[PDB]
């Protein structure tokens, strides 16, 4: 079929078909353009007119312009020949290395795995990060979420996980940049290459990349995650492999939708969001999942507007995760990186039956004391510390040292911390905290515990500080 | 003025008042 453009208002374009109305979700191509412009059908307005979302700029479009129904939703090149490559929302290479010669093509829109397809294996996935591991362990094949307001560490944390996990991972990895910084896709691509995760000469590439950055129109941003996720589902089902999925930042998918929502003629829900936020998020989040066929280990960065965790978006996403790392500008502000909030981070495997009681009693032991100290903070603030029971001024001590022992110099932030990155093993972590909690270092100074890897570095640093 | 912060402050002042009235007596 061939339709005509009847109205253009931003990323929203209305098309009128004379015969044969393209179904909802169908992709249409605008005729007469130097570059490929795809319009996804969004609604049937009636009168053989469809309302659509543009996958790119709408400049220069004209009323009356021709549009052909492609007869199917956006379909992209899926398969192993996507590895080491950089793709578009619409599946076009954007790395200047030629076509992507895949055997098959997949539509980015698809139903989520059925209930009888779910898996319930729960294996801790050690990362080398003290805080995460100790208190909110990630799980292989599980859904992980990094929550944070602007500039608190979401991406760097995603960066050190790619290093401490993606790099040894025997399986593919798909990194989908959704509405983030272009500078960043260029930093990562070239890093993947310099470290051979991406190989431009041979077929040893172990990571496919998909990008729809912040310089794109809402439409592209409302779909790249789909493209990204679609690439990943292939390796899960058609190959049955262990996939690692990185998305930075999934909030962008939801902001994308809120940006065209009004032009779609909808009464706004609260906080400006579109009324279909949760369902829009649901049909998507439900595909990002491990099944009996394959396994996905998704690490999704989640932006928090105005730093408010109750904002309908961040708020609506918690339910889709098995583990959550909540970052806080209040912690970051103190110079404690990674700025994870020890009392707002959780993992579904923080179970004695799964990580063990030593792991579990330490974690909870560390959390009690930080909570105990949080409560006193506001009070010794005014009433001072003298009146406090030696019993209580020891927890202030230990807490302040733990607070530090939880920071760590990342290997991807030496440009930031001026410190060599340290990766600590799960047992070095459990033990280090166990001892602080045990009173075994009440003599060393707090500062000795700040920006160090394993507990021995805290002891060494004490001496170095000893003068 | 965040219902969160306001609440955080009330929390610590209600205790202060309590410990402070005690110390007076």
């Amino acid at each position: 079929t061939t339709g005509r453009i009847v109205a253009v208002i931003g990323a929203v374009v209305d098309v009128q078909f004379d015969e044969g109305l393209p179904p909802i979700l169908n992709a249409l191509e605008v005729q007469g353009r130097e570059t490929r412009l795809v319009l996804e059908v969004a609604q049937h307005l009636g009168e053989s007119t469809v309302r659509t979302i543009a996958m790119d700029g709408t400049e220069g479009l004209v009323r009356g312009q021709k549009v052909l129904d492609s007869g199917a939703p956006i379909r992209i090149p899926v398969g192993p020949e996507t590895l080491g490559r950089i793709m578009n929302v619409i599946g076009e290479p954007i790395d200047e290395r030629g076509p992507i010669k895949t055997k098959q093509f997949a539509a980015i829109h698809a139903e989520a795995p059925e209930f009888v397809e779910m898996s319930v294996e729960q294996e801790i996935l050690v990362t080398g990060i003290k805080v995460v591991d100790l208190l909110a362990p990630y799980a292989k094949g599980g859904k992980i979420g990094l929550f944070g307001g602007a500039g608190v560490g979401k991406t760097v944390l995603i960066m050190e996980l790619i290093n401490n996990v993606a790099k040894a991972h025997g399986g593919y990895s798909v990194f989908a940049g959704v509405g983030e910084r272009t500078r960043e896709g260029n930093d990562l691509y070239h890093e993947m290459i310099e470290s051979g995760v991406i190989n431009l000469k041979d077929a040893t590439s172990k990571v496919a990349l998909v990008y729809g950055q912040m310089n794109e129109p809402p439409g592209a941003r409302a779909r790249v995650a789909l493209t990204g996720l679609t690439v990943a589902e292939y390796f899960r089902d058609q190959e049955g492999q262990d996939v690692l999925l990185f998305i930075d930042n999934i909030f962008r998918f939801t902001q994308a939708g809120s940006e065209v929502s009004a032009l779609l003629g909808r009464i706004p829900s609260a906080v400006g969001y579109q009324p279909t936020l949760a369902t829009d998020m649901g049909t998507m989040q439900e595909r990002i999942t491990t099944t009996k066929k394959g396994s996905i280990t998704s690490v999704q960065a989640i932006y928090v507007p105005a730093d408010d965790l109750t904002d309908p978006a961040p708020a609506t996403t918690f339910a889709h995760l098995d583990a959550t790392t909540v970052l806080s500008r209040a912690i970051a502000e103190l110079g404690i990186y990674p700025a994870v909030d020890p009392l707002d981070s959780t993992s579904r495997i923080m179970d004695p039956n799964i990580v063990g009681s030593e792991h579990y009693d330490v974690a909870r032991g560390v959390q009690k004391i930080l909570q105990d100290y949080k409560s006193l903070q506001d009070i010794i603030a005014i009433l001072g510390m003298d009146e406090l029971s030696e019993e209580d001024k020891l927890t202030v001590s230990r807490a302040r040292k733990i607070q530090r022992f939880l920071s760590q110099p990342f290997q991807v932030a030496e440009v930031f911390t001026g410190h060599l990155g340290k990766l600590v093993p799960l047992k070095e972590t459990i033990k280090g905290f166990q001892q602080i909690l045990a009173g075994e270092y009440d003599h060393l100074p707090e500062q000795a515990f700040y920006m160090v890897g394993p507990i021995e570095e805290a002891v060494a640093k004490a001496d170095k500080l000893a003068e | 003025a965040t219902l969160k912060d306001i609440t955080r402050r009330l929390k610590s002042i209600k205790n202060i008042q309590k410990i402070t009235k005690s110390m007076k007596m």
């Binding site: 179904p23 009324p275 | 219902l3």
Partner: protein
């Protein structure tokens, strides 16, 4: 034929606007060519705004819509037990068709005012804090409320698990069938959930209605009613049934989404003026019938997710206002080591002791009181540079009683085990014990009497209270065990 069938004028955001269908009734199920169902929520002068039960990719302008004439009803009865069904009663556990004889209508009016009687039979959770201080009776509607990840669903699960003590028993008036409704949850969570229940052998007496994250709004909307009907079949037939709505927060969202897309007027938080009525008509269907009606019951544990502890936000306000009490969970408590995170001072049970056993009351009562008393002084502790031994006493009872309310998950206790342990601190036996040890004490102490003393517990159980005798026997059992304990 525009009387029994219609044509789609426009379709989007899951709202179908059909022309024709002149004979449809409000809320009637209709069918689109493609096979998709839809429910008529807006009967307008010039059109029918239909709520599509599925992907609106399968509907186009002009599609023909036909009436079914039938209103929404669902399978019901004993064959659903141990099954995992969607909001329409369809089986989703891939175990084969549910052999359902009876079919009930999802939205029915609650039993009136005459057909009932005071809630009097205990509904035991197995959780000491709840069972001794926030008692639930059969026919009661008690809300579990709290922020994200505070322990809400765990309460319900321990509760379900706990009913095996009576479901494996012979007394058929103590058995309680369980119904768990999952609304807006991700499929992996429910899968994990059903697993935990299978592993505890509680699926035999449980039905799981599941309307998850990717299911269309209307199914998430309906889920709680369709699960309610299922529990009504038991209620009406002299049988007892327990229902957990997890969460009512997500269903409210589902409803708000359709309301706004059908363009009804939005009020505070964008919720329709009839959101209060959506839950009240649901939570009232829970009730204790009169023998004249079978004496059967329907207890409901609805879950509400608060935000930053804002119990006064809109939906949390409605539901609190509708139910007979609330179990308030708190993060601060949780991270401070109190698990389950029940805030005992703000939690409530309008039904109260009318639902506690005499055994429990025998202990619950003084515990409730020393705790309230501790709560008055607690804040002093940490600066108590010189408190009199009067109040210094209440701080001690305070921290021990508090440690007795602690509890691990998946291990609900028998009312007799709870009173034996509560008796221990309440009577003063753990007053000289170290706070750090009460958790260890109880565990071992209870292991001991569950091993060696099943005849005293059987007494307590039977006699329903603590006889002067069994009282004396417990004194010795704890004073010798304690001695053993600090050797």
């Amino acid at each position: 034929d525009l009387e029994e069938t219609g044509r789609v004028l426009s379709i989007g955001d899951g709202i179908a606007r059909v022309h024709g269908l002149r004979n449809v009734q409000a809320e009637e199920m209709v069918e689109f060519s493609s096979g998709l169902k839809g429910m008529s929520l807006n009967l307008e002068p010039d059109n029918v705004g239909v709520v599509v039960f599925g992907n609106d990719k399968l509907i186009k302008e002009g599609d023909i819509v036909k009436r079914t004439g039938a209103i929404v009803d669902v399978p019901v009865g004993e064959e659903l037990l141990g099954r995992v069904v969607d909001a329409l009663g369809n089986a989703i556990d891939g175990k084969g068709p549910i052999g359902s004889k009876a079919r009930r209508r999802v939205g029915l009016k609650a039993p009136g005012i005459i057909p009932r009687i005071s809630v009097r039979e205990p509904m035991q959770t197995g959780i000491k804090a709840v069972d001794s201080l926030v008692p639930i009776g059969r026919g009661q509607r008690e809300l579990i409320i709290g922020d994200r990840q505070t322990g809400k669903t765990s309460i319900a699960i321990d509760t379900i698990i706990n009913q095996k003590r009576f479901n494996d028993g012979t007394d058929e008036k103590k058995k309680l069938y369980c119904i768990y409704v999952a609304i807006g949850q991700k499929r992996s969570t429910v899968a994990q959930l059903v697993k935990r229940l299978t592993d505890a052998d509680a699926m035999k007496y449980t039905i799981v209605v599941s309307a998850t994250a990717s299911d269309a709004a209307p199914l998430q909307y309906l889920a709680p009613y369709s699960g309610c009907s299922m529990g009504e079949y038991f209620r009406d037939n002299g049988k007892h049934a327990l229902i957990i709505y997890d969460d009512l927060s997500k269903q409210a969202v589902a409803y708000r989404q359709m309301s706004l897309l059908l363009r009804r007027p939005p009020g505070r938080e964008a919720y329709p003026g009839d959101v209060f009525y959506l839950h009240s008509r649901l939570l009232e269907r829970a009730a204790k019938m009169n023998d004249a009606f079978g004496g059967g019951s329907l207890t409901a544990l609805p879950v509400i997710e608060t935000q930053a502890g804002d119990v006064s936000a809109y939906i949390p306000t409605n539901v609190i206002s509708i139910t007979d009490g609330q179990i308030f969970l708190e993060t601060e408590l949780f991270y401070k080591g109190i698990r389950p995170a029940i805030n005992v001072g703000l939690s409530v049970s309008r039904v109260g002791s009318a639902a506690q056993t005499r055994a429990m009351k025998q202990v619950a009562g003084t515990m409730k009181l020393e705790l309230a008393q501790y709560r008055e002084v607690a804040a002093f502790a940490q600066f108590g540079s010189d408190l009199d031994a009067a109040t210094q006493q209440l701080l001690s009872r305070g921290v021990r009683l508090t440690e007795l309310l602690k509890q691990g998950q998946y291990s609900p206790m028998a009312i007799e085990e709870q009173v034996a342990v509560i008796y221990a601190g309440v009577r003063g036996y753990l007053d000289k014990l170290e706070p750090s040890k009460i958790t260890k004490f109880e565990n071992a102490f209870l292991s001991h009497v569950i091993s060696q003393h099943q005849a005293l517990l059987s007494k307590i159980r039977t006699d329903g209270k603590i006889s002067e005798e069994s009282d004396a026997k417990l004194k010795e059992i704890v004073t010798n065990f304690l001695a053993g304990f600090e050797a």
